[PDB]
Amino acid sequence: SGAIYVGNYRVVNRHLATHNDWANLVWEDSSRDLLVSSTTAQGCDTIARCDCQTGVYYCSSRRKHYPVSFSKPSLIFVEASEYYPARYQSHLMLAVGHSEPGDCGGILRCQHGVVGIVSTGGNGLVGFADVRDLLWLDE
Ligand SMILES: NC(=O)[C@H]1CCCN(C(=O)Cc2cccc3ccoc23)C1
Ligand SMILES: [Zn+2]
Protein backbone atom coordinates (compact mmCIF):
# COMPACT_ATOMS: atom_id res chain seq x y z
CA SER A 1 0.00 0.00 0.00
CA GLY A 2 1.14 3.52 -0.87
CA ALA A 3 1.28 5.94 -3.78
CA ILE A 4 2.55 9.46 -4.71
CA TYR A 5 -0.04 11.93 -6.00
CA VAL A 6 1.62 14.84 -7.86
CA GLY A 7 -0.55 16.93 -10.20
CA ASN A 8 -2.48 14.68 -12.58
CA TYR A 9 -0.27 11.63 -11.79
CA ARG A 10 -0.49 8.63 -9.45
CA VAL A 11 2.94 6.91 -8.88
CA VAL A 12 2.87 3.30 -7.63
CA ASN A 13 5.07 0.16 -7.34
CA ARG A 14 4.44 -1.48 -10.76
CA HIS A 15 4.04 -4.93 -9.03
CA LEU A 16 1.10 -3.49 -6.98
CA ALA A 17 -0.63 -1.59 -9.85
CA THR A 18 -4.41 -2.08 -10.32
CA HIS A 19 -6.43 -2.57 -13.58
CA ASN A 20 -7.26 1.20 -13.38
CA ASP A 21 -3.53 2.06 -13.25
CA TRP A 22 -3.06 -0.07 -16.43
CA ALA A 23 -6.17 1.33 -18.25
CA ASN A 24 -4.84 4.90 -17.62
CA LEU A 25 -1.08 4.06 -17.99
CA VAL A 26 1.28 7.01 -18.67
CA TRP A 27 4.67 5.21 -18.19
CA GLU A 28 5.85 1.93 -16.60
CA ASP A 29 9.31 0.31 -16.01
CA SER A 30 9.66 -3.24 -14.53
CA SER A 31 13.44 -2.65 -14.04
CA ARG A 32 12.50 0.17 -11.59
CA ASP A 33 9.24 -1.38 -10.22
CA LEU A 34 7.39 1.86 -11.19
CA LEU A 35 4.14 2.65 -12.90
CA VAL A 36 2.64 6.04 -13.34
CA SER A 37 -1.13 6.28 -14.13
CA SER A 38 -3.30 9.30 -14.91
CA THR A 39 -5.78 10.75 -12.36
CA THR A 40 -8.81 13.04 -12.45
CA ALA A 41 -8.07 14.90 -9.17
CA GLN A 42 -5.08 17.29 -8.60
CA GLY A 43 -2.47 15.59 -6.35
CA CYS A 44 -0.48 17.84 -4.04
CA ASP A 45 2.72 15.92 -3.14
CA THR A 46 5.95 17.89 -3.82
CA ILE A 47 8.79 15.95 -5.50
CA ALA A 48 12.36 16.55 -4.29
CA ARG A 49 14.89 17.56 -6.99
CA CYS A 50 18.16 16.98 -5.08
CA ASP A 51 21.05 14.59 -4.15
CA CYS A 52 20.07 14.05 -0.48
CA GLN A 53 21.29 10.94 1.29
CA THR A 54 19.34 11.33 4.55
CA GLY A 55 15.60 11.37 5.04
CA VAL A 56 12.49 9.88 6.74
CA TYR A 57 10.32 7.00 5.50
CA TYR A 58 6.96 5.66 6.68
CA CYS A 59 6.96 1.95 7.86
CA SER A 60 3.40 0.52 7.89
CA SER A 61 4.48 -2.77 9.59
CA ARG A 62 5.43 -0.65 12.69
CA ARG A 63 3.00 2.32 12.09
CA LYS A 64 6.16 4.50 12.43
CA HIS A 65 8.21 7.07 10.44
CA TYR A 66 11.99 6.36 10.70
CA PRO A 67 15.02 8.58 9.98
CA VAL A 68 17.48 6.82 7.53
CA SER A 69 20.70 7.34 5.61
CA PHE A 70 20.40 5.99 2.14
CA SER A 71 22.63 5.21 -0.83
CA LYS A 72 22.75 6.86 -4.29
CA PRO A 73 20.36 5.52 -7.01
CA SER A 74 21.88 2.33 -8.47
CA LEU A 75 21.51 -1.23 -10.02
CA ILE A 76 21.06 -3.81 -7.24
CA PHE A 77 20.42 -7.56 -7.47
CA VAL A 78 16.90 -8.46 -6.27
CA GLU A 79 16.08 -12.16 -5.69
CA ALA A 80 13.22 -13.80 -7.64
CA SER A 81 9.62 -13.06 -6.46
CA GLU A 82 6.05 -14.01 -7.62
CA TYR A 83 6.03 -10.66 -9.58
CA TYR A 84 9.51 -10.75 -11.16
CA PRO A 85 12.27 -13.21 -12.08
CA ALA A 86 15.71 -12.73 -10.37
CA ARG A 87 17.22 -9.53 -11.91
CA TYR A 88 19.01 -6.18 -11.25
CA GLN A 89 16.57 -3.36 -10.30
CA SER A 90 17.84 0.10 -11.35
CA HIS A 91 17.46 3.47 -9.54
CA LEU A 92 17.30 1.59 -6.17
CA MET A 93 18.57 3.16 -2.90
CA LEU A 94 19.34 1.06 0.20
CA ALA A 95 19.12 2.07 3.90
CA VAL A 96 19.55 0.30 7.21
CA GLY A 97 15.96 0.00 8.51
CA HIS A 98 13.08 -2.38 9.25
CA SER A 99 10.71 -3.32 6.40
CA GLU A 100 8.31 -6.15 5.49
CA PRO A 101 6.66 -7.02 2.05
CA GLY A 102 3.48 -5.04 2.92
CA ASP A 103 5.70 -1.96 3.38
CA CYS A 104 6.04 -1.30 -0.40
CA GLY A 105 4.67 2.15 -1.31
CA GLY A 106 5.70 3.87 1.94
CA ILE A 107 7.05 7.29 1.07
CA LEU A 108 10.71 8.33 1.62
CA ARG A 109 11.00 12.15 2.16
CA CYS A 110 13.77 14.72 2.84
CA GLN A 111 13.48 18.53 3.50
CA HIS A 112 13.18 19.03 -0.34
CA GLY A 113 10.17 16.77 -0.88
CA VAL A 114 9.30 13.24 -1.94
CA VAL A 115 12.40 11.15 -2.73
CA GLY A 116 10.85 7.78 -3.57
CA ILE A 117 8.87 4.79 -2.27
CA VAL A 118 9.73 1.42 -0.51
CA SER A 119 10.13 -1.25 -3.20
CA THR A 120 12.53 -3.89 -1.68
CA GLY A 121 13.91 -4.87 1.79
CA GLY A 122 15.02 -7.72 4.09
CA ASN A 123 17.86 -8.70 6.50
CA GLY A 124 17.70 -5.31 8.28
CA LEU A 125 17.78 -3.28 5.00
CA VAL A 126 15.14 -1.26 3.05
CA GLY A 127 15.24 -0.41 -0.67
CA PHE A 128 13.53 2.67 -2.20
CA ALA A 129 12.70 3.23 -5.92
CA ASP A 130 13.89 6.80 -6.65
CA VAL A 131 11.65 9.32 -8.54
CA ARG A 132 13.78 12.57 -8.35
CA ASP A 133 15.03 12.10 -11.96
CA LEU A 134 11.44 11.95 -13.41
CA LEU A 135 11.24 15.67 -14.21
CA TRP A 136 8.03 15.24 -16.37
CA LEU A 137 5.95 14.66 -13.18
CA ASP A 138 5.99 18.49 -12.62
CA GLU A 139 5.09 19.52 -16.20
N1 LIG B 1 11.05 -4.66 -6.07
C2 LIG B 1 10.80 -5.96 -6.12
O3 LIG B 1 11.17 -6.67 -7.05
C4 LIG B 1 10.05 -6.53 -4.93
C5 LIG B 1 8.78 -7.27 -5.37
C6 LIG B 1 8.02 -7.83 -4.16
C7 LIG B 1 8.92 -8.70 -3.30
N8 LIG B 1 10.17 -7.99 -2.97
C9 LIG B 1 10.62 -7.74 -1.73
O10 LIG B 1 11.59 -7.03 -1.53
C11 LIG B 1 9.88 -8.39 -0.58
C12 LIG B 1 10.28 -7.79 0.75
C13 LIG B 1 10.85 -8.58 1.75
C14 LIG B 1 11.21 -8.02 2.97
C15 LIG B 1 11.03 -6.66 3.20
C16 LIG B 1 10.47 -5.83 2.22
C17 LIG B 1 10.12 -4.44 2.06
C18 LIG B 1 9.57 -4.33 0.85
O19 LIG B 1 9.55 -5.53 0.17
C20 LIG B 1 10.11 -6.44 1.02
C21 LIG B 1 10.91 -7.54 -4.16
ZN1 LIG C 1 16.33 16.67 -0.63
How many whole angstroms from 84 Cα to the centroid of ligand 2? 30
By what technique were these coordinates determined? X-ray
- Quote the CA–CA distance of 122 and 126 in Å, as a whole number: 7
Burial class (CB in 10 A: 0-12, 13-18, 19+), 42: exposed
Query: Residue 108's closest CA among 86, 80, 128?
Result: 128
Going by alpha carbons, the residue nearest to atom 11 of ligand 1 is: 101
Number of the ligand closest to the Cα of 115: 2
Is 33 labeled as catalytic in the residue annotation?
yes
The resolution of the experimental structure, rounded to one decimal in Å, is 1.7
Specify the ligand 1 atom closest to the Cα of 78.
Answer: 3
What phi, psi does 14 have (nearest 5°)?
-55, -40
Radius of gyration of the chain (CA): 14
- Are the C-beta atoms of residues 4 and 109 closer than 8 Å to each other? no
